[PDB]
């Protein structure tokens, strides 16, 4: 089961739940950078289900989701802020509204 985990950097890394505990879960990450870990539930959420000025998330770097504002859009391009960077549609999304686990 797929999940997103808050890194110590406040960004969210994709993963899945390999095991459940009384007070932890065991996540493996969908990346070779990070190993299996027991995690507190308040650090874990579900991934989300299926415009300028917007508050969005963005895919960056091990890569994961950071909170960003679209400063300006032109052509294929979005100027975003977190630092500042020019990205394309595929690296962006509205904020994952999901809450962490209870």
General description of the model:
The protein is mostly beta strands. It folds into two domains: 1-43, Roll (SH3 type barrels); 44-102, SH3 type barrels (Roll). It has strands at 2-6, 12-20, 25-29, 37-39, 44-45, 55-60, 64-74, 77-81, 84-88, 92-94. A hairpin with a 2-residue loop joins strand 8 (77-81) and strand 9. This is RNA-binding protein FXR1.
Describe how the helices and strands are arranged:
Blueprint lengths: L1 E5 L5 E9 L4 E5 L7 E3 L4 E2 L9 E6 L3 E11 L2 E5 L2 E5 L3 E3 L8
Subcellular location: Cytoplasm, Cytoplasmic ribonucleoprotein granule; Cytoplasm, Stress granule; Cytoplasm; Cell projection, Dendrite
Family: Belongs to the FMR1 family.
Protein name: RNA-binding protein FXR1
In brief:
Residues 1-47, 54-95 form the Agenet-like domain. It is found in: Cytoplasm, Cytoplasmic ribonucleoprotein granule; Cytoplasm, Stress granule; Cytoplasm; Cell projection, Dendrite. The chain folds into two domains: 1-43, SH3 type barrels (Roll); 44-102, Roll (SH3 type barrels), CATH 2.30.30.
């Amino acid at each position: 089961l797929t999940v997103e985990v808050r890194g110590s950097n406040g960004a969210f890394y994709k993963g899945f739940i390999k095991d459940v505990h009384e007070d932890s879960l065991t996540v493996v990450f969908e990346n070779n950078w990070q190993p299996e870990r027991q995690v507190p539930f308040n650090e874990v959420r579900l991934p989300p289900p299926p415009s300028e000025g917007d508050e969005v998330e963005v895919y960056s770097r091990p890569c994961g989701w950071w909170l960003a504002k679209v400063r300006m859009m032109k052509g294929e391009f979005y100027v975003i802020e977190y630092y500042n960077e020019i990205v394309t549609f595929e690296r962006l999304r509205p904020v994952n509204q999901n809450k962490t686990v209870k």
